[PDB]
């Protein structure tokens, strides 16, 4: 009946497997990442099955966000503080990428990033 005490879900192996796919290698994306990217590329090339895949992509985004949370609540602040910038950043880009999908199924980055975009 009262307010329940604060508890946090631990970091899981499935989270680390997702984390490493998002931040993979210099010349290669991780399977989960390369995939999510293809799906977003696909849902954007379409405008009206679509909602069947979009629902799955929104779950995938949700997983990245779930992952950030558990990582941020974890006991080892030292490991997190060394990656907070990268981790926080992907969670933020996903949140808005997700939101953009929900908008399609219902009808930042600074100055360096702006110069980045102004190039092929």
């Amino acid at each position: 009946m009262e307010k329940p005490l604060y508890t946090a879900e631990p970091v899981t192996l499935e989270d680390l497997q997702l984390l490493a796919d998002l931040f993979y290698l210099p010349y290669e994306h991780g399977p989960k990442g390369a995939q999510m990217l293809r799906e977003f590329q696909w849902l954007r090339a379409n405008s009206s099955e679509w909602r069947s895949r979009a629902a799955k992509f929104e779950e995938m985004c949700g997983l990245v966000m779930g992952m950030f949370t558990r990582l941020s609540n974890c006991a080892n602040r030292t490991i997190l503080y060394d990656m907070y910038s990268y981790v926080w950043d992907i969670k933020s880009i996903m949140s808005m990428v997700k939101s953009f999908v929900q908008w399609l199924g219902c009808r930042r980055g600074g100055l360096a990033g702006e110069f980045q975009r102004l190039l092929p």
């Binding site: 009946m1 009262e2 329940p4 005490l5 604060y6 503080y81 910038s85 930042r108 600074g110």
Partner: protein
């Protein structure tokens, strides 16, 4: 006149270390600023695990930290955020809260702040009965602790509706703020981030709007240089978008800066320039304050 001008360490990320905080005090002194709000989100015991107690290791650190605040003529405020899992009604809760603040008072801290920022608006069944609205629950425990600590000179309060966007239906018509403004003791100060969380501008009219409802001038928690929400962007710009006209209409300004401590020179230096420009109720040019700060900063690089 008592105006609280200084820095708030209230960001999500790696918190600042002893020697950084000490350096911040040296700086705030030299620039005639006077306050420091201790709210690092990393600190489990300030937020998440508020009920828990500082160890001997922890205790010695905070003491040493508070000793430097006094040493550099800076007012240290210890903030506490219990609104996560707190049972407002239950007296053991209220008892543990008092036990924690007692331990903190043992360290040499006299000024406090109770933050109800970013917490679930709905109460549990136990608190729901005892208190009229969510505002009544917060105001009750606040006034209680305030008086419990012998009505201190500096006692801040952070509402859940701490900015313009968060107000239901709007600032002037919010029954939440109406409750706080009417029931919260006048000795207590209220925190405001302005029209938004990261307000581009803080218009004078907007501050008169909120002042009328809270029945007092607020203390601005300024997120202008805050970068926790985008650690891929750094803010070396001058404090801008706040009229000097706001100073006689405010009880203070505490800036929540960039996470990277060294990257905060220009923010604090320009805040000091802004403050000193109209200390007493166009005086300030952001562009000019910037050149001022960079000329001073340049020395540090050697």
């Amino acid at each position: 006149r008592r105006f609280l001008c200084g820095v708030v360490e209230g960001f999500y990320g790696r918190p600042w270390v002893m020697e950084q905080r000490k350096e911040l005090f040296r700086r705030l002194q030299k620039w005639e600023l006077n306050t420091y709000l201790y709210a690092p989100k990393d600190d489990y015991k300030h937020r998440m695990f508020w009920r828990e107690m500082y160890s001997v290791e922890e205790a010695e650190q905070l003491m040493t930290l508070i000793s430097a605040a006094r040493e550099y003529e800076i007012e240290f405020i210890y903030a506490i955020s219990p609104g996560l899992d707190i049972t407002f009604s239950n007296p053991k809760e209220v008892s543990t809260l008092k036990r924690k603040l007692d331990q903190v008072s043992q360290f040499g801290c006299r000024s406090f702040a109770l933050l109800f920022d970013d917490i679930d608006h709905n109460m549990c069944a136990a608190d729901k009965e005892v208190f009229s609205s969510f505002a009544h629950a917060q105001v009750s425990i606040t006034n209680e602790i305030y008086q419990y600590l012998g009505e201190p000179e500096t006692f801040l309060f952070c509402p859940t509706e701490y900015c313009g966007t968060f107000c239901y239906p709007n600032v002037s018509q919010s029954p939440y703020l109406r409750t706080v403004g009417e029931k919260l003791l006048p000795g207590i100060e209220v925190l405001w981030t302005g029209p938004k969380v990261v307000s581009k501008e803080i218009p004078v009219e907007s501050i008169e709007e909120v002042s009328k409802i809270i029945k007092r001038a607020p203390v601005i928690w300024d997120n202008i240089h805050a970068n926790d929400y985008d650690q891929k962007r750094l803010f070396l710009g001058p404090y801008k978008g706040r009229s000097t006209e706001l100073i006689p209409r405010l009880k203070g300004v505490l800036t929540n800066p960039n996470c990277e401590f060294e990257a905060n020179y220009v923010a604090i230096h320009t805040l000091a320039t802004w403050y000193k420009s109209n200390m007493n109720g166009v005086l300030y040019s952001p562009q000019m304050a910037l050149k001022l700060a960079l000329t001073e900063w340049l020395q540090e690089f050697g």
